[PDB]
Enzyme design. Structure first.
Site, PDB file in Angstrom:
ATOM      1  N   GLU A 168      -2.724  -9.828   3.592  1.00 35.69           N
ATOM      2  CA  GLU A 168      -3.655 -10.434   4.591  1.00 35.69           C
ATOM      3  C   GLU A 168      -3.997 -11.909   4.317  1.00 35.69           C
ATOM      4  O   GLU A 168      -5.087 -12.151   3.752  1.00 35.69           O
ATOM      5  CB  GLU A 168      -4.992  -9.689   4.614  1.00 35.69           C
ATOM      6  CG  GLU A 168      -4.893  -8.256   5.077  1.00 35.69           C
ATOM      7  CD  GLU A 168      -6.147  -7.693   5.741  1.00 35.69           C
ATOM      8  OE1 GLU A 168      -7.284  -7.990   5.268  1.00 35.69           O
ATOM      9  OE2 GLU A 168      -6.002  -6.916   6.721  1.00 35.69           O
TER      10      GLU A 168
ATOM     11  N   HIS B  58      -3.628  -5.340   0.541  1.00 34.66           N
ATOM     12  CA  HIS B  58      -3.003  -5.927   1.760  1.00 34.66           C
ATOM     13  C   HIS B  58      -2.924  -7.426   1.552  1.00 34.66           C
ATOM     14  O   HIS B  58      -3.945  -8.012   1.235  1.00 34.66           O
ATOM     15  CB  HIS B  58      -3.795  -5.549   3.018  1.00 34.66           C
ATOM     16  CG  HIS B  58      -3.643  -4.114   3.383  1.00 34.66           C
ATOM     17  ND1 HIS B  58      -3.534  -3.712   4.682  1.00 34.66           N
ATOM     18  CD2 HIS B  58      -3.517  -2.994   2.631  1.00 34.66           C
ATOM     19  CE1 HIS B  58      -3.407  -2.399   4.731  1.00 34.66           C
ATOM     20  NE2 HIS B  58      -3.366  -1.934   3.482  1.00 34.66           N
TER      21      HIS B  58
ATOM     22  N   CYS C   6       0.873  -1.196   0.000  1.00 35.88           N
ATOM     23  CA  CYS C   6       0.000   0.000   0.000  1.00 35.88           C
ATOM     24  C   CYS C   6       0.905   1.241   0.000  1.00 35.88           C
ATOM     25  O   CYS C   6       1.642   1.400  -0.960  1.00 35.88           O
ATOM     26  CB  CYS C   6      -0.985  -0.056   1.164  1.00 35.88           C
ATOM     27  SG  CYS C   6      -2.472   0.944   0.885  1.00 35.88           S
TER      28      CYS C   6
END
Length: 189
Positions: free
Chosen positions: A172, A170, A81
């Protein structure tokens, strides 16, 4: 392979990256963007660098811009990001407003299946936490785009010569198998 310098740009997600990288057997060290000089990083002797997300812009991200510019081509760098935007800006990139600001939604991006996307399903559903994007027509010639939103946003860039790569989303995961395989790609180049 061993020692990862993760640069905290004041996000909770830098600790997710910490856990994910530690679970892949990396020696990770987490330092805040304002608690470091470039002289510091020589002492730490990192093997790879990761630039974290953060609520700021690259200009307000302390040393992040300085680190990418100085260690480009000496160690692998992965931008997430903010770090992805910082990587564009570092080489004269322009960050612009997005079509729709996304505060946690998951969406399908298409990729080139190279770099961190090698051995990943295409298309790929990712989670977005950003309002700004790298402008495509301004993107420096030293960068290839590697992933696209379906609204045609830059979702990943990679240097044509050096090992520095960005993602706008992200990562994640790492219990998602195709999420573990994405960070392992950075780790085991």
């Amino acid at each position: 392979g061993g020692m990862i310098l993760l640069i905290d740009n004041y996000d909770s997600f830098t600790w997710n990256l910490y856990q994910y990288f530690c679970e892949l057997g990396a020696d990770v060290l987490v330092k805040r963007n304002d608690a470091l000089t470039l002289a510091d990083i020589d002492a730490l002797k990192p093997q790879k660098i990761v630039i974290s997300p953060g609520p700021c812009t690259p200009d307000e991200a302390g040393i992040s811009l300085d680190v990418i510019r100085h260690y480009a081509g000496r160690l692998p760098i992965l931008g997430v990001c903010l770090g992805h935007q910082a990587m564009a800006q570092a080489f004269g990139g322009k960050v612009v407003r997005a079509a729709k600001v996304m505060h946690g939604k998951t969406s399908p991006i298409t990729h080139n299946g190279e770099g961190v996307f090698r051995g990943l399903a295409n298309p790929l559903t990712v989670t977005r936490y950003h309002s700004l994007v790298v402008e495509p027509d301004s993107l420096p010639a030293c960068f290839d785009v590697t992933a696209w939103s379906e609204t045609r946003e830059i979702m990943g860039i990679r240097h044509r010569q050096w090992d520095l790569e960005g993602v706008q989303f992200h990562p994640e995961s790492i219990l998602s198998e195709q999420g573990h395989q994405l960070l392992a790609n950075f780790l085991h180049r």
